[PDB]
Amino acid sequence: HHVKIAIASDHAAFELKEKVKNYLLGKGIEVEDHGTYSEESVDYPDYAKKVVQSILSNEADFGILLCGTGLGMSIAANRYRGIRAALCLFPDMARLARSHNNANILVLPGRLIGAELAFWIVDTFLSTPFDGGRHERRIRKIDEV
Amino acid sequence: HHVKIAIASDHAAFELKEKVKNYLLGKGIEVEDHGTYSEESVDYPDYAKKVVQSILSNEADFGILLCGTGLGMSIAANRYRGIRAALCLFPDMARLARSHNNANILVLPGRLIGAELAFWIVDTFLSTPFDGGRHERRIRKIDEV
Amino acid sequence: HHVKIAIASDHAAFELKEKVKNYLLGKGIEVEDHGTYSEESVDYPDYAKKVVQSILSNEADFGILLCGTGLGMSIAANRYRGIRAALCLFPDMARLARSHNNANILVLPGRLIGAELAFWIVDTFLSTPFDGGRHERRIRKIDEV
Amino acid sequence: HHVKIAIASDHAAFELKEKVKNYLLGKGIEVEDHGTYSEESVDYPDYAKKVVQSILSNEADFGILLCGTGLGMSIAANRYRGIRAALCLFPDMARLARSHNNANILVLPGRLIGAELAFWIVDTFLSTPFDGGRHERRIRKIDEV
């Protein structure tokens, strides 16, 4: 449980964000919730930036970003060198995001998946090591922009 | 059929890339294939950059990028301002990628989905307009990095 | 809105069942809720049978069955000749379930999908006609046991 | 590798059926291929029955059935008492199909999923034990028709 998560969502994925946060808190995982804090309409990139800043500053180990489909977050967060944000719809995607892409942000679709599936994806994401190997060159090439 | 597509993949998604290319060619859609041109091992970011350059230079209207899971491509392509690359696993995701995110690159997982599903995703992506509206602010915010 | 739905779930998919029911009711669609009526533990086949009976007696036009993954319901309901229960995880599956399989029961996974995705699947299921054609022989063969 | 699989598909899922068969054969798993043996048009229920008969006669340990979407096979095979055929689109579904439903037939969508994903689903299906417990009552209730 000694892993620190920075989490954020827009209004469309607020409900799932809350469930994921509470799931983590229930395991004694340290969670910083960057919002949003209601279902009033907000813009996803504002929230991507808060989690990004926390990862780039080494203030959290992993990020979790959520919007309706995950697409907006997957686009906004990956604007930043050093960020590898992975939109995962089932656990094997999270496994590979970690194993192959050394992903540091998990992106979830708040209107598309169920909470219990989200929890399995989160557990896989947080418990899978990076394989290194031939993947390392590829991850470095992402940031050779 | 007057739409121009720039397509690329790594070796893991070469087979699906070829099928998608041929599907497009069979409809009389202009396709520029940036490679890779075999199953010999290559690095996905090298191929993301070729499609990106083509979109940013207004040499193609839409990009299609493929790797094993789509994750590497979704990360690498979204490093670039002006690029909105959307990892879509089923047609409604492509619909929303266009409607809400004005996506200009479709990312597909070459080992995860079937060809006929990929074709439906592609058809949806290429035939859905951007809604504009309140989405426009969000897409602009992505590039306010 | 002149379509009558018989719906049921076990305890694991109670929450989604309620959301789907209320979604339908909000469109003025007639819904008969066969339960379950809480999250206390129950057995999915008991609920499959209630919706099945309603379809076979021509008391409802379509059924909707839900459990955690959809698997139990897809197995239990398809024990009955005349029932074509289709486990659909995204809208194109519901489209084909109707177009090709003339499905009369939609099965949804209550822990795996999000409510808004479920609503799109339901809308597709209820609004897609059967194509007939060469599919008719296949549907008849299902019941030649 | 001492597990015997009976496999069958219609024409729409012939390609994936062949890949799955060869994957199994490459691990030294005994596979009986009930067809179909080309892409000429056939009717899925004819093939469901062949695998079903093999499972009910204790001539194979597990079945694998494939059609375009999996829906036809999931309906046709589950007509038979003693058969628990599970349409699985990702590995966790196969895990639960085994753990909770003691599934004896895996159903795969031949046009919807990629081969490497199918292989992961198959590996999970064949390597997961039934949990028993409170699931046993439910599986018995399926056959109390």
From TrEMBL, chains A, B, C, D:
Signal sequence segment: none
Keywords for the protein's UniProt record, in alphabetical order: Isomerase
A Pfam family recorded for this sequence: LacAB_rpiB
GO molecular function: ribose-5-phosphate isomerase activity
Active site: C67 (proton acceptor), H100 (proton donor)
A biological process term (GO) from this entry: pentose-phosphate shunt, non-oxidative branch
SUPFAM superfamilies reported in the protein's UniProt record: Ribose/Galactose isomerase RpiB/AlsB
Residues involved in D-ribulose 5-phosphate binding: D10, H11, G68, T69, G70, L71, G72, N101, R111, R134, R138
InterPro entries xrefs: RpiB, RpiB_LacA_LacB, RpiB_LacA_LacB_sf
Family under the similarity heading: Belongs to the LacAB/RpiB family.
Protein name: Sugar-phosphate isomerase
Lineage: Bacteria, Thermotogati, Thermotogota, Thermotogae, Thermotogales
